[PDB]
Amino acid sequence: MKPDETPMFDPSLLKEVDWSQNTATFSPAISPTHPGEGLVLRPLCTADLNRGFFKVLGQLTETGVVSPEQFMKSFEHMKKSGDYYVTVVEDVTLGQIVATATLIIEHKFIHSCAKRGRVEDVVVSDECRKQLGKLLLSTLTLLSKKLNCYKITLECLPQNVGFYKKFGYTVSEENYMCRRF
């Protein structure tokens, strides 16, 4: 039970995607396979722990004091389900995570027992203002349409609506309601 290089899902699944079906604009043109010079687009592994993964998460929102056992426990149950796709971009020649986004598969009974996707926890490093945000969002979206998700949704503040539209997301009429404890 110690951090290693085991991924959460089959890496080939990211290189397997129909990148011809990309909606976004890329200049210079990049891909899942070749995401940028120095860069690796892959699944999250437990070793990423050391490599700034929380440094990057900590930009988007609170990450408290995270123990190693709690992170591997969380990861293990995420790997176990097959429903989580935490997807990271590492700057290889630094040993540092520079971007993350999560795909989540919800299983449903409606629309003839369809699956649906949720995009969570999207953050690009302060450092890399390298086209990662586009790359992650277009990759994950396309993965969802291949894991036979009928739809995929996400929540985001107004300022970011425009960003998400380049992937063919649109504003729904439905409000988002929350309650903490």
Next chain:
Amino acid sequence: MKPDETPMFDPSLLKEVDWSQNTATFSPAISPTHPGEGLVLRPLCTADLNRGFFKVLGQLTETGVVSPEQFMKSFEHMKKSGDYYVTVVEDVTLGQIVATATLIIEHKFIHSCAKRGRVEDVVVSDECRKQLGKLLLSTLTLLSKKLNCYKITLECLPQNVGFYKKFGYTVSEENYMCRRF
């Protein structure tokens, strides 16, 4: 692999909840244990298939042609995860489902590896205009705060915002964006 009376989760988990911590108004006063005359509040079992479960789902939104094997497959993987809580109200003296709502647990790395809840697929039968909607929403919400979810969210159209507020949900500033395929 045939429909039976096995629940998706431990039924005691619904009767276990801190019903004193209820936010909603009930006249006459009902509970998870005693949900109404004739009624049972419990987990979804695969036998529910026969018992109008889709009749009720079909009110909220499309359910296409659903095979038995696809429903048990979906159910099985939902049971397997521990993260799904499809929760049903059956009118016992009819063999009929009259209400459903789903709790879903998302595992995260943020807020020190917290869990969060999602309320999905809320429908009360055309027949029972018996306090079920309140009962389900207050039960599930309370379950979430006990499965150590730091928060719980849902999406809903404007007309239903007021309904959700009696459970201590509130409008977030975040838009809801969708894309189908």
